[PDB]
């Protein structure tokens, strides 16, 4: 909606300029990391890792010429600096996880995610084809890891902490 997405200090989340941690509201002891999935040799899947807190920071990007993010905007989400597109999130079918969040090194002008208010924080919602129907991102437990993946109706709820510790 028309609500501005805010950080844990109540300040608007910026459009690309600043990085933020997605801190799970009931898993502050864990944080986002990359892991291997399937038979891949390099880690390209996004997990919630109990050994890293607060985890890898993200940037939220919209092509609109505005410097804040609203819940209604389609977003790219990416690891790494603004200048790099090697950490851009997408959702990719990968057995046996399902529709897994993974990183890729290409980026569409308009990404497929939205950040939507849920409970005490926000959920990440993936819209296949940037259509009207959104699928909640939650956790899928496989191979001793908690993968971020589509789990509609069971979102992982996050607060968004500006990454000023770096």
């Amino acid at each position: 909606g028309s609500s501005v997405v805010v950080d844990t200090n109540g300040q608007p989340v910026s459009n690309g300029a600043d990085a933020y941690y997605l801190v799970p509201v009931s898993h502050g002891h864990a944080g986002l990391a990359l892991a291997k999935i399937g038979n891949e040799a390099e880690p390209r899947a996004v997990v919630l890792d109990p050994h890293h807190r607060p985890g890898l920071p993200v940037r939220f990007e919209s092509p609109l010429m505005i410097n804040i993010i609203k819940e209604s905007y389609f977003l790219n989400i990416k690891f790494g600096p603004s200048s790099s597109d090697s950490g851009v999130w997408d959702v990719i079918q990968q057995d046996p996880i399902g529709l897994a969040v993974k990183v890729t090194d290409t980026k569409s002008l308009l990404g497929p995610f939205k950040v939507e208010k849920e409970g005490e924080g926000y959920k990440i919602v993936y819209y296949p084809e940037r259509g009207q129907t959104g699928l909640d991102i939650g956790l899928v437990h496989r191979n001793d890891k908690y993968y971020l993946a589509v789990k509609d109706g069971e979102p992982c709820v996050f607060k968004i902490r500006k990454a000023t510790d770096e």
Binding site: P63, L64, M65
Partner: protein, 223 residues
């Protein structure tokens, strides 16, 4: 605004600042004493609007007014297709007295002319990634529809046009949303969206094509 300069003070007296908790988040354009045109993506349930500004500190700007607005109307086809029809009209709670520093501008009836040099103004990011203290102005030139569609299809729609992309790296940037693009004395566009980062050679920015909406604007203001 990338690679621009301070505007001559009050040279763009239609410029409106949309502020939230005392910080600018978009611009708009005074088009009637009681109406501000801005990008529909800047929609909020209420607004505080700064008119007559140069710096954003109204307490240092004689002739300025900070005015409230509750009502705004997004174009009914905003975001279908995605990013298209990016305009809204904000009705001020009261009509403003126009002056030499607060003045409406006429909207172009004719659509953009490829190649024509125009002016964009705003308080958005500079080349150095910082916010300016005063309103910035820069010239950008209209790009042909053929080039706009080549670069931006499948998201190019004739409610848009492209400008900029010069060797000069002159561009609008984040925080310039909703502000004016003036061509040949008339309001031609609103800052809307673009490919990041700002100021890339060969990459124009995208502006709301207001020549397509003159009837809807007139009808909305009159209703």
């Amino acid at each position: 605004i990338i690679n621009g300069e301070d505007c001559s003070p009050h040279s763009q007296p239609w410029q409106a600042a949309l502020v939230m908790e005392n910080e600018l988040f978009c611009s708009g354009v005074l088009v009637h004493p009681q109406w501000v045109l801005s990008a529909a993506h800047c929609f909020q349930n209420s607004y505080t609007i700064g008119l007559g500004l140069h710096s954003l500190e109204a307490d240092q700007e004689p002739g300025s007014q900070m005015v409230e607005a509750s009502l705004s109307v997004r174009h009914p086809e905003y975001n279908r297709p995605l990013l298209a029809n990016d305009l809204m009209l904000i009705k001020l709670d009261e009509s403003v007295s126009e002056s030499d520093t607060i003045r409406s501008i006429s909207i172009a009836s004719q659509c953009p002319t490829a190649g024509n040099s125009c002016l964009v103004s705003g308080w958005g990011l500079l080349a150095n990634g910082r916010m300016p203290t005063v309103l910035q102005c820069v010239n950008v030139s209209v790009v042909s529809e053929e080039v706009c569609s080549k670069l931006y299809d499948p998201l190019y729609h004739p409610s848009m046009f492209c400008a900029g992309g010069g060797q000069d790296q002159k561009d609008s940037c984040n925080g310039d949303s909703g502000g004016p693009l003036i061509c040949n004395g008339y309001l031609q566009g609103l800052v809307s969206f673009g490919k990041a980062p700002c100021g890339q050679v060969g990459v124009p920015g995208v502006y709301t094509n207001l020549c397509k909406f003159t009837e809807w604007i007139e009808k909305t203001v009159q209703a």
